[PDB]
Amino acid sequence: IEREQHHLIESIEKSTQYMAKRRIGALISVARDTGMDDYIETGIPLNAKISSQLLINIFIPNTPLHDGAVIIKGNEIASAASYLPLSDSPFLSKELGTRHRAALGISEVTDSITIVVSEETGGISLTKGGELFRDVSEEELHKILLKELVT
Amino acid sequence: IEREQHHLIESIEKSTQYMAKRRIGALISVARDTGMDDYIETGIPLNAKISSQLLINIFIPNTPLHDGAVIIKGNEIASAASYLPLSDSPFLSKELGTRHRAALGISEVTDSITIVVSEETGGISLTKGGELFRDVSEEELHKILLKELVT
Numbered sequence: 417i418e419r420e421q422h423h424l425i426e427s428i429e430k431s432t433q434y435m436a437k438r439r440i441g442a443l444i445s446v447a448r449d450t451g452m453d454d455y456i457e458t459g460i461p462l463n464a465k466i467s468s469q470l471l472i473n474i475f476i477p478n479t480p481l482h483d484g485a486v487i488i489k490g491n492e493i494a495s496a497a498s499y500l501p502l503s504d505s506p507f508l509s510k511e512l513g514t515r516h517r518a519a520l521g522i523s524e525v526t527d528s529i530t531i532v533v534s535e536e537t538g539g540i541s542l543t544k545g546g547e548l549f550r551d552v553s554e555e556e557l558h559k560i561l562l563k564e565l566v567t
Numbered sequence: 568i569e570r571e572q573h574h575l576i577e578s579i580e581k582s583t584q585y586m587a588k589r590r591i592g593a594l595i596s597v598a599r600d601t602g603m604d605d606y607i608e609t610g611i612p613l614n615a616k617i618s619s620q621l622l623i624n625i626f627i628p629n630t631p632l633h634d635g636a637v638i639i640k641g642n643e644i645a646s647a648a649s650y651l652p653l654s655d656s657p658f659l660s661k662e663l664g665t666r667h668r669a670a671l672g673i674s675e676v677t678d679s680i681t682i683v684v685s686e687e688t689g690g691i692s693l694t695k696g697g698e699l700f701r702d703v704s705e706e707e708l709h710k711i712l713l714k715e716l717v718t
């Protein structure tokens with residue numbers, strides 16, 4: 417139980433660090449108490465073991481799986497290329513793309529934690545409860561993943 | 568059960584056709600009666616639902632999951648980037664590459680069905696029981712997969 421949360425955070429940090437250094441857009445939504453069943457159906461069901469290697473391969477550009485969101489439920493990568501609700505927020509910075517707006521929209525209707533990697537800048541962002549934390553350091557990302565994903 | 572096997576066939580056909588037209592080298596071994604857990608242990612575990620989209624994403628070059636073979640066990644992509652033993656056969660044409668020799672090798676020690684996509688020519692090959700069916704057409708690959716995977 418404790419080890420599953422450790423691997424999940426490590427898999428997220430390693431994968432996003434890889435993609436951030438290569439300007440690879442990413443969109444990983446980790447479900448919590450709410451339940452994102454209807455949003456898992458919108459993509460390709462994987463029900464896969466969580467690994468940093470698989471997360472990297474999913475968001476590779478011009479691939480069948482990169483256009484959408486990875487949804488992590490339980491101890492599995494539930495699906496890839498899934499579609500999340502888009503937030504109509506006017507406060508989200510105009511220079512942020514569809515990935516950030518979809519990450520913001522899912523945080524407004526679920527208690528899930530969502531991670532974003534900008535394909536334009538390589539910055540990492542987080543969304544929770546209708547708010548976005550932009551361009552986080554590895555230390556900031558680690559603290560928030562601990563606070564939100566560890567029970 | 569019957570739809571799992573036919574979906575497995577479709578996933579292989581669509582993924583290999585996608586990669587053949589782009590000269591993306593691929594190596595897919597489908598286990599049958601002989602266990603391949605020894606070679607699954609050599610790759611990265613996925614335990615993922617079978618789909619053509621995931622097969623395509625795995626074999627994208629210069630990615631963590633691509634360097635090796637995909638092993639399919641039961642109704643799952645068991646592992647990616649797995650090792651397959653190289654046949655010592657001198658009968659295998661020198662025009663072919665390591666993927667073909669690796670497919671031939673596992674076909675000699677298992678009853679598994681293995682699919683190869685040449686990254687040089689795009690041709691689709693097939694190994695079974697020590698035999699090589701080289702550069703098969705789509706109609707050929709379709710009939711072979713039906714006879715050998717639908718039980």
Ligand SMILES: COC(=O)c1ccc(C[NH3+])cc1
Pocket residue numbers: 421422423425426429558566
């Ligand atoms: C629960 O997870 C942890 O405590 C944890 C600690 C360190 C790393 C490595 N950066 C990942 C995870």
